[PDB]
Amino acid sequence: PGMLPWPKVDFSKFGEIEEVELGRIQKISGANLSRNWVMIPHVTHFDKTDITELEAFRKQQNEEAAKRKLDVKITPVVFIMKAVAAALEQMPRFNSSLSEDGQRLTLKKYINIGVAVDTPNGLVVPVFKDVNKKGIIELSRELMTISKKARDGKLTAGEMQGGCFTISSIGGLGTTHFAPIVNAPEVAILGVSKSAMEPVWNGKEFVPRLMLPISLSFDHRVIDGADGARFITIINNTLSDIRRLVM
Amino acid sequence: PGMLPWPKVDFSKFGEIEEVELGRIQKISGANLSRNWVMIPHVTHFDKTDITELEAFRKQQNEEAAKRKLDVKITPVVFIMKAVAAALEQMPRFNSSLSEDGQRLTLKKYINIGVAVDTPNGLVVPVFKDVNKKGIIELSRELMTISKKARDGKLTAGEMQGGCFTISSIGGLGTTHFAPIVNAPEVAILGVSKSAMEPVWNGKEFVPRLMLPISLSFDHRVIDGADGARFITIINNTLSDIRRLV
Amino acid sequence: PGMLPWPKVDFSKFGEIEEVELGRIQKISGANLSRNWVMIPHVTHFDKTDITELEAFRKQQNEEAAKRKLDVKITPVVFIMKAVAAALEQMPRFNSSLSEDGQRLTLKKYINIGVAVDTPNGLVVPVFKDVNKKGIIELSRELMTISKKARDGKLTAGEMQGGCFTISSIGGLGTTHFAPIVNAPEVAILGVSKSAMEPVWNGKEFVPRLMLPISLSFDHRVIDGADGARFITIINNTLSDIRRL
């Protein structure tokens, strides 16, 4: 509009350089991000959830699947998808998309969750259908299947759409927290960082508990701060108690 | 300008949908927020303040107001208001507004603070006048009244303006920290998250202390990083030491 | 465009005011920030690094130069400079700049790092050249000189040009973490907050360790989430395993 333009400077004046044309994909990504960033007023909430019992449960279930030879591995991100899916039911406004002119809100009745997955071509986001209607075992098989397909790059565009919400877990690579960008036309995204044993006050003394840090970036046009806090809390509570497993 | 449009998707290829029009109030706020988001380069500072003594002082104070029947609950946010007000005097540049062209900064000598209150239609921000000249009892009394007014939706436009700074306390609902958006034409906003008992090093051992996490988002055109850190430290030091309060 | 204008309010209605015109510098940096904020999709990563051994080594080195009277104070930010420079080597894509149209990426082979320094007129960012080639003692002396120069306001043009990466350490003044704005045309910026002794699990008990909080904002058009995590982890690992030097 009436602002300063990009800073054009001769980099060779300082030393050797090398210029590279981005891939066509990297360009599309960059274009979507520039739009998302400018159009969506971002607010990020941070939180930590006690997954001590979730972890013991996950290992317990993997053992049971091992003795009867099921060839299925339950990763912790499966429980995160389920916790998110449950939360989208209780707070339907997070399961939505805002119109282009920002006038109308489309409330989605179906629950599909995109999960960021690392490929040699950087992160991509496959979408899992009806997370709310599928069990841990079935989702784990899907995640397993989609994983290798992801790392090979044999991915169809059709598999990468229909998302209502995104989960990005980068804790395996690091960070204690992060502030992600919302994936339009979705209205929110959950970030997951590395877990760690922490001293938690029980009322008389500190006790070691396995804490999982999470973050929630949301479109502030659609969601207000109070509703954001209620949402990340529900996810917290759900993850810190796996009685949701016994339907 | 020359960027991609909002994605168009036929959402019904996926399942049942329901399109709904936003409320009048909602379109206005989201329109304010879009402007605030792009015209204000945001920096967010995070911090934690030891409120162990403040909590004991607060429960002591209104158990005596109960003894004299003053009909007033002292909420924690009242103390945060005073701490912010005191910090605004010590660093006047935080109590200001940038002109549209960004050449002129208006330093305000008055101190009014907007505080976010939850209502049936979401958070609203009523403004409290001369926070630096009012006592804990008076502010708490206004707070009870104005919050009650806000929930019924009877708030007046005059009670919604004159703001110099904004406080948003959502810790009663959750989060350990958050990064809020500045409410133009203001310059800074303070967020308050949920408190927790945490192990704090005393020099020889860890001891349990009640820690309140706070956050400060500010207009980086007006405020640089060092002053932002100095500002949140003052708020921290004021809340962690009730002497500075009185 | 199709957006609200800046709010228009007469503030004298509410009480005493005083309008002040910004200095030229303040106007200039504010204009830069407004563009950077809008043109760069920001993502901020957070982390903590165990600097217990670094701090013990740093104090040993200072006490040595002290008795020899060599006039050199090693500050923690010098180690961070070395850690970042090293990371810039391992992950060259952070050592770069994106074109105005966002189609071309300029990979640099030189490593210059700007470090935020406080002055009577606020923070300024003088650039230190060839950090990957220079030692800790040498950088410490450079830092002392340029810092005194900045506080006196005698920094040349060239002394503040050529940066590839910015480090802003405000931990001496406060904060437990913060999310800074990328200094275009750079691609990332590292913030450093106040260190504190924290309990750390060793497998059977909590032991006290000195933890330094760091944060990383970056141009998400160039850097994705995974590589952002890898980058901040390298700096973390380098700072916690001082042996690596």
TrEMBL record, chain B:
Highest taxon above the source species: Bacteria
Subunit structure: Forms a 24-polypeptide structural core with octahedral symmetry.
Similarity section: Belongs to the 2-oxoacid dehydrogenase family.
Annotated function: The pyruvate dehydrogenase complex catalyzes the overall conversion of pyruvate to acetyl-CoA and CO(2). It contains multiple copies of three enzymatic components: pyruvate dehydrogenase (E1), dihydrolipoamide acetyltransferase (E2) and lipoamide dehydrogenase (E3).
Protein name: Acetyltransferase component of pyruvate dehydrogenase complex
Organism placement in taxonomy: Bacteria, Pseudomonadati, Pseudomonadota, Gammaproteobacteria, Enterobacterales
UniProtKB/TrEMBL annotation, chain C:
Coiled coil: none
Stated family: Belongs to the 2-oxoacid dehydrogenase family.
Function of the molecule: The pyruvate dehydrogenase complex catalyzes the overall conversion of pyruvate to acetyl-CoA and CO(2). It contains multiple copies of three enzymatic components: pyruvate dehydrogenase (E1), dihydrolipoamide acetyltransferase (E2) and lipoamide dehydrogenase (E3).
Known partners and oligomeric status: Forms a 24-polypeptide structural core with octahedral symmetry.
Protein name according to UniProt: Acetyltransferase component of pyruvate dehydrogenase complex
Organism of derivation: Escherichia coli O157:H7
Location of this fragment in the whole protein: 384 to 628 of 630
